[PDB]
Symmetry: C4
Subunit: 389 residues, 4 copies
């Protein structure tokens, strides 16, 4: 075992293959499955695992009532074997709280959870299954983090955190960890105006985090991190192809250095992109308004070119079905000469879009890149809401 070094380039991606799907809500209609949200995946030398924030109740349990709520003392980050659904029986509690990230450095797994009241939240940083560091709120307003995996290089795992308003300028920091100890803290710099819920990946010595501007932009901010120097820059995705939700129609040109505003009725969703010159892919909901559908668009030079448009697309979830959050991960320990992009889509069921039930939960689908031109279909959740009425 050795520390992961981000030595390899991204693999070429022409289409996406199915990696995993847990069918959590179909199964959970009858079996004992935990209510969750904010899922992701993360890998290590042995394979990949699913992660999510439990609501500390099962789906069919009476306590599922009220699980639209984001923050409670009953939430925790749980992990489990990829492809299984998350039950009380097969889930590892990583940390306690209602906002998380996790990553493996090649040696051990770091997991971070925030908990506490809005004005006095704190992070606990775990490494190798033991708590190492605690970080108090610096701005007194929902200290929070990625809700997908962090990335490590030579033992240094940067993590993007935000504390402050959802709907105004906030205080974002990049905290560089090693073995769960703080090596450096940086205040966000550059042109991104608001940062939440960063989806990060590493390639060729560089970490890129594609985030959520909940204040203004329907274009996604991008943080570019040098994990050796422990420095960063920020701006927006250049491309006119807008990938937040809600968003206005894609304009004639994007903006690399400022938010493109508009869209109704919601100010943002967690998402991701892989950015590698011609080899660039943007995910987004198919609906511009609602967390409905999910598509992958190949947008050459999305990172640098304001005129860049899609050259190919793959529907991941049809627009007659609910999506949710999406995020990046990579199996950095695959037996490949390149790092192959993967992503997941959270498939949210229940409130608020389906209000015939009292709960809010999700299932997971994940896909990874192929160089081939693979056929596709819709990987929607596949539960019948009427069965839960």
């Amino acid at each position: 075992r050795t520390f992961l070094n981000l030595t390899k380039p991204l693999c070429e991606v022409n289409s996406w293959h199915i990696l995993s799907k847990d069918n959590a809500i179909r199964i959970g209609e009858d079996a004992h499955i935990l209510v969750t949200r904010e899922p992701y995946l993360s890998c290590d030398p042995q394979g990949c695992r699913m992660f999510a924030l439990s609501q500390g109740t099962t789906l069919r349990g009476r306590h599922a009532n009220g699980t639209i709520h984001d923050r409670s003392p009953f939430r925790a980050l749980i992990s489990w074997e990829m492809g299984q659904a998350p039950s009380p029986y097969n889930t590892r509690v990583e940390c306690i709280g209602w906002s998380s990230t996790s990553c493996h450095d090649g040696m051990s797994r770091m997991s971070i959870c925030m908990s506490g009241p809005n004005n006095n939240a704190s992070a606990v940083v775990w490494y190798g299954g033991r708590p190492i560091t605690e970080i108090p709120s610096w701005a007194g307003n929902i200290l929070r983090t990625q809700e997908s995996e962090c990335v490590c290089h030579k033992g240094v795992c940067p993590v993007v955190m935000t504390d402050g308003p959802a709907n105004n300028r906030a205080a974002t920091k990049i905290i560089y960890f090693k073995e769960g100890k703080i090596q450096k803290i940086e205040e966000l710099a550059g042109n991104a105006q608001h940062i939440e819920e960063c989806s990060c990946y590493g390639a060729g010595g560089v970490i890129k985090c594609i985030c959520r501007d909940n204040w203004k932009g329907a274009n996604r901010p991008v943080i570019t991190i040098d994990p050796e120097m422990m420095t960063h820059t920020s701006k927006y995705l250049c491309s006119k192809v807008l990938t937040d939700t809600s968003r206005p129609n894609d304009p004639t040109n994007g903006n690399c250095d400022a938010p493109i505003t508009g869209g109704s009725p919601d100010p943002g969703v967690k998402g991701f992109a892989f950015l590698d010159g011609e080899n660039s892919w943007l995910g987004r909901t198919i609906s511009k308004d609602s967390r409905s559908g999910y598509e992958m668009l190949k947008v050459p030079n999305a990172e640098t070119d304001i005129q860049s448009g899609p050259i190919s697309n793959q529907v991941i979830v049809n627009n007659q079905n609910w999506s949710g959050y999406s995020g990046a991960f990579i199996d950095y320990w695959a037996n490949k000469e390149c790092f192959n992009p993967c992503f997941y889509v959270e498939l949210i069921r229940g409130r608020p879009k389906e209000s015939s039930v009292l709960w809010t939960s999700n299932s997971i689908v994940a896909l990874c890149g192929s160089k081939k031109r693979l056929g596709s279909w819709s990987w929607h959740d596949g539960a019948e809401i009427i069965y839960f009425e």
Copy 2:
């Protein structure tokens, strides 16, 4: 650990002993057991596992309604400890999709699943739990494979795949893998006219696959594969003892080189045979029309002699009970000087034969050869359908 080499001959078999039985439908009437079909078993150096395609719901769940359907985005290949019933709590997702095969090469397990729409399916080939290779449909019509284990020799594991019509000429290939990477692809050669759902085993450096002709024949095709030269031949089982379902009455003579037509109402079922001169055994349903009952027939020189008939019989599932698919496997890592034939029978319950429930599922029974003359009884599923009404 080392690559398996198929150096041993097949064991002499005079009767069949019980290996495993999961009683899935009985247990699943109350416990949380996944709906499945297309089960099989496959072994490795440590022992044997059960496999099946989940339908992504439990048997008592409301989502079991409509599980007669073969292909959905909710299906996956799952494995579990031999003899347990498949629950959401004890099952490993091998890959996602609605047609599979799996085999261990002595080092690691290869698993393959096809998924996607009819006109644009793809396979993902996994090795040691990681995705290695993707394979797009070549004929745009339900790319599909064995539904039982593949077989490896010196790290080379041939797999039979078909893409094309169920009811007409299709495009079958033999794809030879090593550590999940394609070493060679062959188009089907020889006199078999249609190939599905091959049941394969190895002995003395030869792999023999006994398949389903869904187009014409009630006699089963046989593909003989040389995993070193990576070449093959094909024809039909010679014996007059016809083993597909539906089938006509056994004729006075079989046909080694052309399908024997007839039988109603169903064009085919997955089955198997062990072919070893005098030591040859043919499985089939007892009913010539329906997937009812299951019998083993010792048919010396079935592979070569059109006049060959049964010299002994063992009833596996009586003809008052439902059967289903059957397939071959061997514990190639047993401490014996010969490789001992094993087989399973899928015991399908529910639709279409039992239309008083809304679901279709199965349990498994598996048996292996004995040189002794063992007594026998019926290993039917054993659930009472009235309890599910």
Copy 3:
């Protein structure tokens, strides 16, 4: 890691301490617990496990109806971590059948199950999780075995099997296994007239099997096996303290070399004793008529003296509660200079004694010896039958 040898003496036993209790019926009133009967424990270098014959249904399932029946195609030998209750999720299928034994030889575990119809049963013998040997019925009448552990010495594990009538002379054999292979078969010799369901333990290079005479005797047969010579002798417990059920009142004098007849209404139950001169303990039901209560009696020289009576007692299960089978096991790999006796009691619930339910199952309690003088209370099952109405 080596083959176990049985050279150590039995520990002094003055009282019995609680080892385990699984509370399976209390738990299974709501949780998914398998219906069982014929439990036991067996140990290995790592610890001890519980074992039993599943009925291939949960306790609360509709298929629990009719589980009074002893033999079906849906039974199997299952093992689980000591103390847990047996669910579909935590149980290992050892072999398939309706009569079993199991033991560890210090290297691997041998498990044997008989299955099939009454007139044509067979045993399959497993070693290290793989089938090794098959044994066809020799008398055409319910080939059957111990229902508690076997014992091994220097690789050789004798097992006592019976084939033949329950109510008349039968054909008992002692089969001596090594690595699941037959080393020697012996016909029952000596003065025991009928042998079933031997409870066996080793000490001082000698295996003693205390059995059930279902034909005539209310005294228990004792077979004494020499595992190095692979020879045996048989007779009856000499003591006047009669330990089968049903049995008459204890007479003035026992009978070492013939069955003492009498008792009503049942011809026998599986039981056990530890026979070590002054250090001898007999178990039995407290009721002479029914499988009610369970007591341990210290009966010095029970093996040799027809006049021997109890000098001390410990009630294990009060006579207001149901018992069942009882059997011997020892943790031969304990860090002691002597082998400490242990036993279990099967706590049978449901039919025929509790006929307000449709099922029959059991829970387990197990105790081992202490040289101390420990207090005691009843370890009855603890479920309320009313809750199952």
Copy 4:
């Protein structure tokens, strides 16, 4: 791989961070969660586990009725992965009985359980999952122990046990174990007048046990143990800050050498403190009367100063929610230069305080020390009792 030495000092503690919370009652409203009480945590070189006394029934089970009662033959000590809720499927049975302690010595875990009738209980001492020693009641009145973890130094693990009246002078002993074997027994000496339910931890070669005086004191006794000499002293916490329940108002001065009496209506609850001069923290229920609320109080020199009062506080459970037992543990195998204090609070639900249900159970929250000044919120159980009506 080596015996734990208590060489390190305690860590500085300024606030408490969340370590784990199992949300057992919330989950157990629907999932198969065992009824427990008397929980704790204990760690080992790999991690930390949760522990509790099962009542041998699930929470939704009909046998949950009557689980207010403390002692039965259906209780056992169970352990499970920290953070999961205790189910029949994920729990290890450590020993059988109705009072326990457990600790790891660096090599293996010792677990002790008392069982039996009030007048004739006995302890069984387990090491590495095997029973080692038995200890009969010495005073014929509910032989009992800590209900939280013991502590080990150079292989020696002292354990505090009591036998005798709950409401009068009793017979307490300190038993010093190594590999589950009694090294030495001491009668309690010093000024503590009654001892129950000690909560113990180690630092700098000293073990301190902060206990429950059920007879007189609302101040807590403190036993100080040298595990090398295997000797002890006893007295009372000096501080005026009284930490038993029920208790009177804190007086002007505490008493180091005698109980401070009063309070209504209950004579005691298990609790804990960490005592390290200025770095001293006392836990107690917020209510002086009932097991309601939980607060940590930083009380410099609480061990030595009868005038010491609180300089900091942290509310762990608000006084609108039920608490219960509380106890100490440390992850002695953390990668830190100091031993970091941790504690748990048992969150009791059901009887007697919530009499609309028939049961009594609990969930667990656990927290460890931080040198930072972390914000806090209430970590109450979170279940809605109405859902169980």
